[PDB]
Design a protein around this ligand. Sequence first.
Ligand code: EIC
Ligand code: NAG
Ligand code: NAG
Ligand code: NAG
Ligand code: NAG
Lengths: 50, 50
Amino acid sequence: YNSTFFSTFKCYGVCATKLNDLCFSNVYADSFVVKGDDVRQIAPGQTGVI
Amino acid sequence: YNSTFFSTFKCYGVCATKLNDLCFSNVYADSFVVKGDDVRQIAPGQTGVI
Ligand SMILES: CCCCC/C=C\C/C=C\CCCCCCCC(=O)O
Ligand SMILES: *[C@@H]1O[C@H](CO)[C@@H](O)[C@H](O)[C@H]1NC(C)=O
Ligand SMILES: *[C@@H]1O[C@H](CO)[C@@H](O)[C@H](O)[C@H]1NC(C)=O
Ligand SMILES: *[C@@H]1O[C@H](CO)[C@@H](O)[C@H](O)[C@H]1NC(C)=O
Ligand SMILES: *[C@@H]1O[C@H](CO)[C@@H](O)[C@H](O)[C@H]1NC(C)=O
């Protein structure tokens, strides 16, 4: 909350407000770089080049 | 996918991922120009000047 800010943050399967009350089993992080118009394509049930 | 890119693309009545498996009956295309803040108004159940 002091340094880093996100333009988009969207969660699926769980309300965000409960993220501090849970514990997570098999955590993986995927990283890549896209353009601004392709960020909407990173979602379930989407079409496009990405 | 080589030349043209869209800032918004939203479909109603069908998942986008099935658009290649179907065939369409009465296809019409409407064209116009708006400002950036009015693009959110082109949707069902919306209010505003547009
Ligand atoms: C110009 C005539 C088009 C007629 C097609 C009629 C029905 C087909 C339905 C949808 C086609 C979507 C075309 C654009 C897809 C953009 C994909 C993307 O990059 O996000
Ligand atoms: C937040 O960042 C500022 C500037 O770098 C720093 O002075 C401050 O100590 C930070 N706060 C915490 C709690 O680390
Ligand atoms: C990221 O790392 C670089 C170098 O390690 C540092 O200069 C920068 O301040 C860091 N940014 C944040 C938000 O911590
Ligand atoms: C994509 O565009 C580039 C640049 O115009 C062109 O050289 C290339 O042949 C195009 N690809 C296809 C499959 O048409
Ligand atoms: C659109 O048409 C113009 C002229 O016909 C052409 O110069 C331009 O490259 C075309 N754009 C695309 C994305 O095909």
